[model samples]
Target: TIKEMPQPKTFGELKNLPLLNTDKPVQALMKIADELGEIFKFEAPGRVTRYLSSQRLIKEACDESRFDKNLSQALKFVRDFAGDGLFTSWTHEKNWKKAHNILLPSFSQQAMKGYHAMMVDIAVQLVQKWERLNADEHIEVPEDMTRLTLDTIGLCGFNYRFNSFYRDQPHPFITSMVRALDEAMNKLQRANPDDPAYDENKRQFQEDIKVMNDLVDKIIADRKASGEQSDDLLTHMLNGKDPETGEPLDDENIRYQIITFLIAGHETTSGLLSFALYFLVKNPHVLQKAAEEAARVLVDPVPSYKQVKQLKYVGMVLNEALRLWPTAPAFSLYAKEDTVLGGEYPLEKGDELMVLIPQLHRDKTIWGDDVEEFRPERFENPSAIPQHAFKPHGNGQRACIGQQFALHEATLVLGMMLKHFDFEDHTNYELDIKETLTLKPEGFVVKAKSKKIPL
Candidate 1:
């Protein structure tokens, strides 16, 4: 029910076209969606990329084909941008399927139970850190939250500990991961061939990846030599066989899996936690309800895998936060063959499509008047919003594989933090969110007092 904007006459005019969030592409995409309907074409060199934001249309885009390739360097400098692993798999059969099936079990609720104790252990470490800074310290929650997630992933994903809490400087893996992600986003529109920086960036990307790959190789080599199967993520990647072929991934692919699980698994959740915490502190009444839920359901020191499931209000709180600030703001689906989308717009083969999820999640038609409010109670109503409209971790077959893992991790961590600490949102943080690989928090401040216990 929207009219399309006239197509730009040339890429030159398009390049200088008015939009929003020049420094933040995700926010910019949402603003573009607001002006030009859900689907619109942007003329870039070599290809025209269509940005899609309608929930039903996005579902159709994912459900239908002409939609195999996830990332075709859809934008300027995003060439194989994410990585050359399971995350960037072009095909489902030869590459995506085999590994997807094997890794699927690792993220299962059961598997998260296996990973829960370690998660809480890391979270307690964080609480202790906060307890040490137990004042109006205006503690750096985002940085510390990310560090906690990094430590959790390294421990739970692969049994490799970064000990991020103790160290002032980030680990080698952490350093390269940020550089790689920063490059991917900041350089997305710098795909000009004649630009000297373009070639330089490409070379820099290759070199940066080498460092990551080399470090991963060392980890795998070290793990294999020890032959210790702790049943963490790396263990599954190494020993878990392809359900279809009864085969394990090669060393190179395993490295990709490691990198993907490490980066993709944690970054999104960390941002979600940061945003969720910010919202909770802002809404004291909602925070009180969530704390009550945690206190009633969760065990002291943290939660069990089973206990985390009963955290309904806590889950709702997190969901509400996700609706406001989805970590992965947009995801792509390619048109493998020319066809009409939502039985309306015509799309061509080899054409790229991106769905700005945040815009769709906040669509006034779908979410109604209180779309911007942090009302967890909305989710209490089973029919609050349309099915595909609330896509925190994407939807359809190509949706995030570790979604349950993320939910489980968030549930336990929030419950633990809520039960143990009372936060005074001293800075009056008004969500100066940063856009990175995820919509991250920028200096959001809150200090914690133990809930009798640090509670």
Candidate 2:
């Protein structure tokens, strides 16, 4: 027999309802989800319903402790069989612990030393390009940033030369991959659960994934055949062993891990750069402060990692950009049981629990009066902010593993940009957003001019 369930229509109603208020976090989350539900009903009901239904299934699965007991079995059956790498073996607790042990050493202070040097090389090329641009020149900053970061990932992560920044010709693979991702998101949004077209799109998505997978597969095969080794992440995975089990990461696991890193290695950082540039141009004072900080910090030929940390204003600017436009706007977890979340609603085992990070960042209650403003000073003093209120990387045990890597890359590029260029928004140009799996600029353009350094 089915029990009666409370149906709250709006965010306000959802928030005020007694049944949903038990878990404050869950309550806050439900409010956001309700809003999304409304939007989905209006825009794409099929997509929304499928997502909601999946959430329920995940929650039920969690309650059964299916994922907890046989983590690999769950991952292999659900993730691998479904061909979705979004939640791969890396998402499991055991796998995370194993991979974390191997990764921690690779991202160590000593390792970052060499990595930072390579980043500076890329940054310098960008600065030189900006120096040559005329004051009136309008450049596609996001496109350039994407190229730069892609090149960085290629050099640092795979020891390959992407030359994305230097090439005037657009790479076909990059173009096709971006287009495929955009198509997939749109298809997912409108897909009917029972529609054959939905299955067709899913098949295409898998095929697109295989394009990159094939490339990576070849690289791994070649490296193994040649017995070559380098200090890259691929090298680390190839040569390194799990300290606990004393076993090297297998080819299948390595493929999944590499794909995750490659996607994350560029996408989020590129999105951040896009938003940061826009925010800085809008708030000239912050831009000037960043410039001042950069000049002070990078007095040497290139800014050191120690010096990058001194750009407090730069950090704030980046933080605020991330707050306003998080890469992963929402994330989901299945309720492991009919548990009490935030403490009120009796969550069914199959209910899909999701958190809307973007809404939480903009919530008037949480952020106070300046919720919509681009103010970096809010994070100037970390202790002043609430813990769960602003989670760009997410919360609990499932937080992003590449947070440190993202931060280091962001600071390096931002520091170099501030030191060398004066940026302004492209006149009469508006920042149009295209939300896919990640938040992306629709067609943003910015003007850059060389900064006059005082001797």
Candidate 3:
């Protein structure tokens, strides 16, 4: 079966696959597939990075027997904040394998069913807040979605409350968290550590991280003191033990895991919601169709678990949005052995292969002529789609652990929002994306008129 799989296509010889030279790196790489070839390379300080764009290349890379997780340059920098956490941990790290085995059951579909009430609780808070706003008010799509998700994960994951919506501004924890993340990423582009300005920026970076660490530390400290038992993520981390090793996660290990869940669990989902809202507002007929499905299936403002499963068209919209802009855009794979790719391209034992999801999703071979268009129907028969053609959650053993949790939370919120509000694009703002570990629409805003009037 592996022998019959489609092979990676190329525009030129393997050695001559174009060298990218551009200021706009991500955008340029995304379109370079159309110009030069399916694969491209760029140079950095210590490494020469290669990016693979075709679905055929992606399918081969997805084979876990041949490849494994390679912490990309950015992810390595992320370790300054999320040290040895599930997301940034090196492949050989013991805690990564241990945590994955212990937490696997907790993120399952059965666990999601248990978390449904909390999901509804936070989502309703968002709907009620939006319902009170005047029809003409320009609502910031990402900010509110961020508020909704941060609060949801806080409540659902650890039984803590962020209360993001009640405050006039973001919680202190979020502000520091963003500042630290930006600085960490900026460090990659900034050289010359000898400069005074560099030291000053580094000082603030540490301070911001302390702000984030203190909050998570408090979350752990308070929970340990409370002794309140509940079925949530923190409870599991605090109590669950490794199946094979038969050892409990230490307080320090739990701390990193909590931080990992807080960041990974919410941020990516928030971006998905923000982008889906933009697509829905821009495409009226698609919006109407999705809203109709939501109205028919939702039955009430707070959707039940069964009703959430029934919102098929709303699910399609989320899938289509991810197809265009996968929030977690790229994943890096490391070769397990010295081998040639597609029986041609040469590789060493430790070579790194980057998969650019944006380009792979737009491959002319897979998506065809109207590849640029936003059409949910393309995903209506998901089973009909080719393998590796769509990898929104990512690939292999190191894929996103919170996949179902994020999907259920998003599907519930979108269905509820569509059922209750009629969205209008008042400003006609074009999509402008912001990259902070994940991708999100930067300045997109909309007006939502409540479909349900006061009695």
Candidate 4:
């Protein structure tokens, strides 16, 4: 069944690959995307790596019949800690299929009705924390966003409380998990494995994993022994059965699923809010427009479940922010059968291809010349954009299940922040990104002046 086809343009060898050879790998990838046009290859010794850079190529690859999600290099490293959780599981893993079916309803729109109060509780805690600060005191944006998101997920997902706002430092679970995630990424970016620093880091990494594992295991054990029941995700995992297989998730599988939600639930949403806040602060007109919508929709302090959906303009702002900086940056795919992509580049079965989201989002042909600018109106009419051209969450059946949950939480936070305060950039800071497992604005800070909310 093997057939031959012409290869796409390539950078030749490992040394010439724009991404690996750079201090800023993402920016280098973007630059290379411009030069290579749509598809390109990197020949690293005997291994071949390909990246899909254009919308057309991405659209072709989106065929679920031919291509499916694969654990990329970063995710393979993440699997050490996350295990066979939904985010890091292999495409056809049994637990992933069962857990996906069992947990899908918890993220549904109807379920958001049950979760709204908890989300608002954490959002108000964040606002109260900010209200205590002086108008001129600059607040670290990402840290607070992380706290807000982490607490929200903790309380909503498992009926547990991280109490992030009450404490000066994040929970030990988070403290360890973030470092573990960073260490995982560092491991991916291999260097001198024999170095003392590497050995020291390896020891710390194992300890960090222990810290997270204990906390997660504790949550699971406590839930089981307490004989308590609720509609939260934890209870569902404990009790719900897959509609097809008629099997409940085992305790071990439930542990991985809980960890997946704890990490995937908060990290990317935190990044989304941080970037949206940065964009709104940087662009006054956008802020004013977003605030206007917030004022109209969020008539009261506690945003009703219905009100969250009505913040149309704020929704546009979130969409635009995601387009520019999708927090869960890149996802990979591999072919099960040998196939040709974009009708030109031939690929063998099991050949992995990474889709660089930033490059795809900024494709000049699709997004036009203003790709770099923060104009939210582009998403005002969603149907106008091409399918797969604006995949902030991801593509196909493997897309983020928590998409609706993240957007709903983000819309509430952005709306409440606008209704409660006017943000100012004290640093006039240029945006710099930090990449762990996800993306966030590095050390981005802003000041807030409380605004009077009217009924």
- Please estimate how well model 4 matches the true structure, expressed as its whole-model Cα lDDT: 0.84
Residues 37-106, candidate 1, lDDT per residue (tens digit)?
6777766555566777777777677655457546634222333533445666755547678888788889
Name the TM-score of candidate 4: 0.93
lDDT by residue for model 3 (1-455), tens: 12322222333433222222223345656766666567666445456556888887788888888889999867887777788888988768898888888788788788898899999999898888888897578788999998999998999888889999998798898898777766655555544445787887888888987887898988888888886778788878888888888987887788888888888888889899999999989899999999999878877646899899888888889999999989988889889998767665667888888888888989878989898888999997868888899987888778889988988999999988998889889999898887665688989999998987321
Between candidates 1 and 3, the one scoring higher on lDDT is 3
Cα RMSD (Å) between model 1 and the true structure?
Answer: 2.8
Ranking by lDDT: 4, 3, 1, 2
| Poorly placed runs, candidate 1 (over 4 Å) | 1-21, 72-83, 198-204, 381-384
Consecutive 10-residue window with the lowest summed lDDT within model 2: 41-50
Ten-residue stretch with the least lDDT total in model 1:
74-83
Among these predictions, the greatest lDDT belongs to 4
Stronger candidate by lDDT (2 vs 4)? 4
lDDT scores for all predictions? 0.75, 0.63, 0.82, 0.84
- Can you write out model 4's per-residue Cα lDDT over 137-218, one digit (the tens) per residue? 8888999999999989988998888889877887898899889877766565453445886888889888998898887987
Cα lDDT tens digits for candidate 2, 1-455: 33323333434322322322231322333354455441121122211111221222223323334222222221332243223333454444455666656666777767776687777777777777777777687777778888878777766777766677677765544665665655544433232335785677567656766677776776677667765657867777777888997777666667777766666678778888888988888888888888888888889877888887677788888899998888766555555556653233345554444445566576665678877888888887888775466767854545666676677888889988888777767575687666545676757887776765431
The list of candidate 3 runs beyond 4 A from truth reads 1-25, 193-196, 453-455
Q: Identify the candidate with maximal TM-score.
A: 4
Q: Model 4: residues >4 Å from true position, as ranges?
A: 1-24, 43-46, 191-197
